[PDB]
Amino acid sequence: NSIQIGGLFPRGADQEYSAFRVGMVQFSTSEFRLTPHIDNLEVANSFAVTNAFCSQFSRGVYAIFGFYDKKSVNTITSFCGTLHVSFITPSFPTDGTHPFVIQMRPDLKGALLSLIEYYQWDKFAYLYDSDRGLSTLQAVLDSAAEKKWQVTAINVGNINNDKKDETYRSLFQDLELKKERRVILDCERDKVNDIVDQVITIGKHVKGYHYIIANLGFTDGDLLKIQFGGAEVSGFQIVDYDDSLVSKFIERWSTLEEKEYPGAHTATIKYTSALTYDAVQVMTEAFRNLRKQRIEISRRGNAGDCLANPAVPWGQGVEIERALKQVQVEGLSGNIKFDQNGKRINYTINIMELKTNGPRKIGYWSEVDKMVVTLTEDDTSGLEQKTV
Amino acid sequence: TNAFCSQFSRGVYAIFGFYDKKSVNTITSFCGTLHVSFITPSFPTDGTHPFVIQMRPDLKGALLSLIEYYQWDKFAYLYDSDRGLSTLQAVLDSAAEKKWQVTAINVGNINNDKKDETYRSLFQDLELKKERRVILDCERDKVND
Amino acid sequence: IVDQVITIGKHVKGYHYIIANLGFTDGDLLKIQFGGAEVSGFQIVDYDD
Numbered sequence A: 001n002s003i004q005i006g007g008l009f010p011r012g013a014d015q016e017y018s019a020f021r022v023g024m025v026q027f028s029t030s031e032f033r034l035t036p037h038i039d040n041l042e043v044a045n046s047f048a049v050t051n052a053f054c055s056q057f058s059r060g061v062y063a064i065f066g067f068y069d070k071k072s073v074n075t076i077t078s079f080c081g082t083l084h085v086s087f088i089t090p091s092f093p094t095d096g097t098h099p100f101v102i103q104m105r106p107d108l109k110g111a112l113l114s115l116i117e118y119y120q121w122d123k124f125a126y127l128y129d130s131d132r133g134l135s136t137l138q139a140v141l142d143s144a145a146e147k148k149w150q151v152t153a154i155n156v157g158n159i160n161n162d163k164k165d166e167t168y169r170s171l172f173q174d175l176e177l178k179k180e181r182r183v184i185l186d187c188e189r190d191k192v193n194d195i196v197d198q199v200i201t202i203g204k205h206v207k208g209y210h211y212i213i214a215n216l217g218f219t220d221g222d223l224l225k226i227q228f229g230g231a232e233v234s235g236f237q238i239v240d241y242d243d244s245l246v247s248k249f250i251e252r253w254s255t256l257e258e259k260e261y262p263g264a265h266t267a268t269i270k271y272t273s274a275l276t277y278d279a280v281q282v283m284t285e286a287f288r289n290l291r292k293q294r295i296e297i298s299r300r301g302n303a304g305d306c307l308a309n310p311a312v313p314w315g316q317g318v319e320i321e322r323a324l325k326q327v328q329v330e331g332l333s334g335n336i337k338f339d340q341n342g343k344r345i346n347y348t349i350n351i352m353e354l355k356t357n358g359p360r361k362i363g364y365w366s367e368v369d370k371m372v373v374t375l376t377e378d379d380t381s382g383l384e385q386k387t388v
Numbered sequence B: 001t002n003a004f005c006s007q008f009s010r011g012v013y014a015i016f017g018f019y020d021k022k023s024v025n026t027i028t029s030f031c032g033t034l035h036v037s038f039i040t041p042s043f044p045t046d047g048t049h050p051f052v053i054q055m056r057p058d059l060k061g062a063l064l065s066l067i068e069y070y071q072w073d074k075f076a077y078l079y080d081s082d083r084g085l086s087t088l089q090a091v092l093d094s095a096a097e098k099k100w101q102v103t104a105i106n107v108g109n110i111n112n113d114k115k116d117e118t119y120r121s122l123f124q125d126l127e128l129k130k131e132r133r134v135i136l137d138c139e140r141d142k143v144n145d
Numbered sequence C: 001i002v003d004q005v006i007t008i009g010k011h012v013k014g015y016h017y018i019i020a021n022l023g024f025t026d027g028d029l030l031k032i033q034f035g036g037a038e039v040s041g042f043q044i045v046d047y048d049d
């Protein structure tokens, strides 16, 4: 029982592929076995993505797991929506209803707007990356008219390789011109790391500044460097390490050799890798349920060419999509459930704060509640003088 | 992608056509890879894209200069995503540099279904307070709507 | 020490540091360079010779 599936990874994805293998081994069963075909390629090049996809389709896979960028997303959604091949991804959710695409990554918009509303910011600067996507920008801009906000949006995404460190000094000093202490980041962990590092270099991490790191991994990058700064830093965490399942995972994860499973020896794991693992679980449950529901999905013939005119799609793909979207499980990212579009529904995003003794969980965010406050409310005698 | 891979098989020397925000990356990537020259009247790409000739002239500079000419320090900006978000970044950075109060609203790309329902209250909320200056960035038909 | 100073963020323009050692430019000076704080030290090897 070999089930051929496709996988598409960037040339710069190590821990993700490692976690993929971890999912392959941990969730492998005796009933059936998945047989992954792996292709490392440049994600930004649509031609390369298309080439690899037509190759995978020539192999005749049942489902494809992979990543995409703002350049290659339309190719993926259009091709999968065309040929009826199921696609699973950790990458950013598309804006719209895109069929045959399962976005494992949950939406952060609600939690962010709820957070800004929580801290009552009426004026701030918002740094955005064009290399990822401009959706959240539109979100907070449209929200600015309703909530009466003064938002100064700056693109950090257009920066050269050699001159990229000037634009940061100019940015922060122009913010000295605007005298605005509240900032939001939302970028790649590496780009974020560079930003934080330059914040430390210019030394704007002193008390009085307030930063919001918008990403799902709060603890994935090194944020220890800004910890003793004195500036308040809030972010979101999708992987709660205080869970039994997560701990039993980290136990095995930490016991892996870094030579065989790159960047897996760490006790902390990037949320993307976690999403990959959970994706493996989900696919496994989906095909297991297909065999359990007595639905014959095996293709008797070859799918052949993806460029055949007119395009002839296979039928079992619909059944696979239905199987995938109807999966409800428990992974590293918490409760996993999908809607008819494939987006994540009913998820819990921990709201985290960075203090002196490290990160602490203040909130828990949901789609329906839109807000939840954990007890918190610590009181100290320090800097509180009982009246005389 | 299919039509491009075709006709190229016929061995054409140059390809003339149009593109949208969804298919633009396909055209530019494929033409930049296979070295097939592509001509378009549609919106210019944001960046340096080789083997692509954008016949359409840039409109950002003229817009910012016109806005500066009418001396508007506060205005509303309605935009569609189908032509690109470059002009948006332009007016945002120009708002940061020239100290403008710009209220930009996207009606484009159907980015939110919510708004469609009870959008009138929004437009009227901006209609009661200020909003003396408005700029339309859309398709001729969308403009008409 | 310098690293702990930048981490706690006392390298702002109000503070003044003196490196008394023979190598001033031998250590990593990029990190406190952009701080805005004045840092003066001693150098025994003149590269202008």
Ligand SMILES: *[C@@H]1O[C@H](CO)[C@@H](O)[C@H](O)[C@H]1NC(C)=O
Pocket: A335, A346, A366, A368, A369
């Ligand atoms: C999420 O759906 C679950 C099933 O895990 C249920 O326990 C709970 O109702 C949920 N939260 C909401 C807001 O429906």
